Subunit: 231 residues, 3 copies
């Protein structure tokens, strides 16, 4: 395990996701409100899935070698397995907060699936120049998602409770900033142009992942917006 | 890319799915009705997914070699990845049109999953005679789906709005004819008996795919059946 | 096929799932009640999926070799493909019976996904001692599911119809006993410590699978709890 310099960040990531999972699990024990239960379920599952995939990367299972540029390049494929399930759960948290219509939710989840799926294909593609074609398609799917979060959701939040409108606005802003960093790190890291070494890349993704999951969850689950308006 | 004679049909397929995706995306921009949004979301996602998988076939990612009959046989596995997601979306379009009950929808999607999954296993099976066992099981799942579309849905459409009944009937008929061709092409093509060469097989699937997705979508999204009855 | 001593149990399993599938399919033909249709759909799909995966194991497709302990160890990976889809369907049968809230259903299905997914990783892991780390995480996800079935569902059933409360209690008890055997068989069988040989392991899983699917389904589909209260 320690044979890879990036192991320290995989281990820290595993620990922080594990701790985040346990914290949300305990916190949600005292919850009976049916609406709050939905948000706790979604939000606890996110770091639990990430915990398993960080562990698989730490132990070496979630790593494969991909030939491109005349080299055997270490590619952590387990990231995409994580993201396939956790990024639509994160979007679902946002969509339920603002009572999004079903068509909009399906558009978001579908675009998200395309985003992660094409990122996976790009990560595993052996023809170097083609990796960036997949990156571009994935990034276009991301831009669609960000567009919807701003010009379909923000003006939906404003007709809702003030506490859900303010909580949505904060989580929207956190999401757009954090999620936009992922394609940049991929592009300059070992999957793309290879300018930033894998150990630093792994650190960067770990900070983004913990912030986008445990950070996000801490903000959401401390808000009164997750509860039905009750006396 | 041009090293494979079937590349021209993969390229045309990619282009037509891409163009179809953009057309539906633009067309649905001016839509606020919650019901119509569902149909636009579902129907736009279908060629978008197909676009990505056609591209993966064009670039060579979605192709593998399978030993059977003492030969290395080129198998485009990306078709099944496409179909796994797009065929239940197509069925969902039909089921929502007639306000199908939840049990019926689950039966359809489940049978569809079995249909595509067993087709994939058959496509990748190395014992030649066993490929046709999987083809038979998949075809039985197809026949179940077609049965339900006729003797569970058609008489559901007739108690609904005339515009939804007439639109459903047309899309049902398009679906049954087009979908029934797929097992025949598989059986006589490079996956099955090998009587029709891969380049012609690829052409045939491209015509079926564009018709079943973009053709289907053009009929559906031009109907007033996708809108709630409103003043 | 007969080259593997466990083939007889794979063949019997295939037959019993096939027969169970046909029986439930015929039985549900005379059903119009929308609630009952849901239970028939879910419950018929379960042995149908299991039939396909038992067949893939019989024909040899669903088997791979995994190096650990200095040996090539036969691992039937198709079990996890089965279980990935059938165990959440089984939980859905239980959850719908007691009209579980959406948050609880998502927690169950999510924990179940983690349970099966980590079992799959453990089954395919090449470092022997690490296989048991994945077994432990999977078992913890199982224990969560069993906890919810007892201390979240049982007291939900009691405020419902007596026929649904009594049917739920029986199916809950069947589920907890049968499902708890699976991690034990894995641990002592060819995936784990290797004390029980593969042919006996295969027998054990076949008895558990038929009981947990066809047995379970026979109890559920003969109950009046699956019908809406109607005059
Ligand atoms: C009911 O609605 C609220 C339940 O949501 C909360 C439900 C949770 C989503 C349940 C899912 C967590 C499972 C219990 C997962 C089990 C293994 C976990 C990964 C635990 C890992 C952390 C520990 C090992 C440090
Ligand atoms: C509604 C939304 C969910 C829409 C989803 C959007 C989605 C369509 C976007 C594209 C997804 C698609 C790229 C998934 C591809 C998975 C694939 C990378 C798995 C690895 O297999 C690739 C090659 C080795 O590189 O296998 C070597 C050759 C092997 C023989 C491969 C044969 C097995 C195939 C992988 C079977 C395909 C199954 C499905 C792709 C399962 C989807 C997995 C998940 C990653 C989407
Ligand atoms: C809101 O409900 C309506 C939105 O549906 C319409 C929503 C669409 C389903 C959004 C999904 C499309 C994504 C934007 C996919 C991005 C890449 C596409 C494959 C674009 C490819 C076509 C172009 C490259 C020729
Ligand atoms: C409700 C509905 C959805 C019901 C669904 C119906 C469904 C049950 C029908 C059968 C689906 C099942 C056949 C999927 C099999 C996928 C498999 C072909 C992927 C390729 O792996 C096959 C061999 C190489 O040929 O791998 C070589 C050996 C490797 C070590 C394989 C180990 C990895 C396994 C593939 C893990 C299994 C994961 C699940 C099958 C994911 C499902 C993928 C999708 C195609 C259904
Ligand atoms: C409508 O709601 C009730 C339908 O549920 C019942 C619907 C069923 C879930 C339909 C799914 C079964 C498909 C017809 C599967 C076809 C192949 C089967 C595996 C048949 C195998 C058994 C036989 C070959 C012995
Ligand atoms: C809401 C709930 C559903 C939550 C779900 C919980 C879930 C997160 C729990 C963990 C699931 C995760 C372990 C699935 C891993 C599948 C993996 C074993 C498939 C086989 O690939 C493993 C190695 C060979 O051993 O591939 C060799 C290297 C290859 C290059 C691998 C590259 C292809 C990757 C497999 C692509 C990943 C796609 C997704 C994992 C699809 C999920 C399949 C299913 C088994 C969950
Ligand atoms: C918890 C993990 C999260 C929130 C991950 C988010 C990841 C993305 C938004 C990834 C986006 C990518 C692209 C837009 C193109 C390049 C490849 C990706 C997959 C890194
Ligand atoms: C957009 C793509 C569509 C509508 C594809 C439909 C495909 C089928 C109905 C495929 C059916 C098959 C069988 C019935 C058995 C042989 C294998 C298949 C998968 C080709
Ligand atoms: C129809 C099949 C059923 C009901 C299978 C149930 C399987 C399980 C509950 C498996 C549990 C496992 C663990 C808890 C850890 C070890 C690995 C598994 C996957 C066997
Ligand atoms: C969105 C953030 C992307 C920028 C990442 C900056 C990383 C700077 C680290 C120094 C680069 C290491 C190069 C020498 C090894
Ligand atoms: C459902 C349509 C299946 C029939 C396809 C007919 C294809 C005819 C093309 C000629 C066959 C090529 C054989 C000589 C290369
Ligand atoms: C939950 C049941 C697990 C116990 C399984 C008992 C199997 C006993 C069979 C005898 C073991 C075979 C060892 C000699 C080959
Ligand atoms: C490819 C995996 C996509 C599914 C991820 C799980 C999250 C799905 C959330 C469903 C949202 C509800 C839509 C109506
Ligand atoms: C194996 C992939 C199956 C899922 C495909 C996505 C479409 C699912 C549509 C869900 C229909 C709603 C059922 C209640
Ligand atoms: C990884 C596969 C998980 C999906 C299995 C299919 C069963 C899903 C049942 C959905 C229950 C409804 C939740 C709201
Ligand atoms: C186009 C929608 C406006 C809100 C999205 C902001 C786009 C940020 C760009 C992210 C950088 C990705 C490379
Ligand atoms: C049995 C249901 C009647 C409607 C379905 C028509 C079946 C068409 C056969 C398709 C050919 C597949 C090989
Ligand atoms: C902790 C919840 C109480 C009900 C679950 C009973 C646990 C049975 C243990 C199963 C054995 C697995 C190794
Ligand atoms: C070796 C790099 C070749 C450049 C490929 C860039 C493709 C980016 C596509 C953006 C439309
Ligand atoms: C080499 C071909 C052997 C014939 C197999 C046909 C099987 C079809 C099954 C239909 C019930
Ligand atoms: C070779 C076996 C080494 C023992 C591993 C047991 C790990 C079990 C983890 C339970 C917390
Ligand atoms: C990680 C295993 C958890 C089993 C005990 C249940 C914890 C309490 C959860 C309350 C919903
Ligand atoms: C509760 C702490 C969980 C941390 C387990 C994984 C950390 C890796 C240590 C090497
Ligand atoms: C908008 C046109 C999209 C076409 C891109 C793929 C066509 C392949 C050209 C070689
Ligand atoms: C209807 C009987 C189904 C049995 C088919 C599979 C049994 C395997 C026989 C070798
Ligand atoms: C993006 C950083 C999130 C910070 C989380 C802090 C949570 C405290 C309530
Ligand atoms: C099956 C062929 C479909 C033809 C689509 C034409 C759409 C015009 C409205
Ligand atoms: C766990 C054993 C189940 C027994 C099923 C018998 C069904 C008869 C109604
Ligand atoms: C990591 C366990 C958290 C302890 C409880 C925190 C207050 C709910
Ligand atoms: C008003 C919300 C500001 C949140 C910005 C957080 C940036 C990481
Ligand atoms: C809305 C601001 C987006 C900031 C992008 C930051 C990418 C590192
Ligand atoms: C391909 C872009 C379509 C242009 C608009 C067509 C009329 C909505
Ligand atoms: C009355 C509907 C006829 C549609 C037939 C289309 C055949 C491709
Ligand atoms: C309902 C008519 C079906 C026609 C099947 C055509 C197969 C090529
Ligand atoms: C296996 C076929 C079952 C025959 C009908 C049983 C009574 C519904
Ligand atoms: C009162 C229900 C008892 C069911 C026990 C079944 C054990 C297999
Ligand atoms: C509730 C009793 C569980 C029995 C476990 C049996 C495991 C073989």
């Amino acid at each position: 395990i320690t044979g890879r310099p990036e192991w320290i960040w995989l281990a820290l990531g595993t620990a922080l996701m594990g701790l985040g999972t346990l914290y949300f699990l305990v916190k949600g024990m005292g919850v009976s409100d049916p609406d709050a239960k939905k948000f706790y379920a979604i939000t606890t599952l996110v770091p639990a899935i990430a915990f398993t995939m960080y562990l698989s990367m730490l132990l070496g299972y979630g790593l494969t070698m991909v030939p491109f540029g005349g080299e055997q390049n270490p590619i952590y494929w387990a990231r995409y397995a994580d993201w396939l399930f956790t990024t639509p759960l994160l979007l679902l948290d946002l969509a339920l907060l603002v009572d999004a219509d079903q068509g909009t939710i399906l558009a978001l989840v579908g675009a998200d699936g395309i985003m992660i799926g094409t990122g996976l294909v790009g990560a595993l593609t052996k023809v170097y120049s083609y990796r960036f074609v997949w990156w571009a398609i994935s990034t276009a799917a991301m831009l669609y998602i960000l567009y919807v979060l701003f010009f379909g959701f923000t003006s939906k939040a404003e007709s809702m409770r003030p506490e859900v409108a303010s909580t949505f606005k904060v989580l929207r802003n956190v999401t757009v900033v954090l999620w936009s960093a992922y394609p940049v790190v991929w592009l300059i890291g070992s999957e793309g142009a290879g300018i930033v070494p894998l150990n630093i890349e792994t650190l960067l993704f770990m900070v983004l992942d913990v912030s986008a999951k445990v950070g996000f969850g801490l903000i959401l689950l401390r808000s009164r917006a997750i509860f039905g308006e009750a006396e």
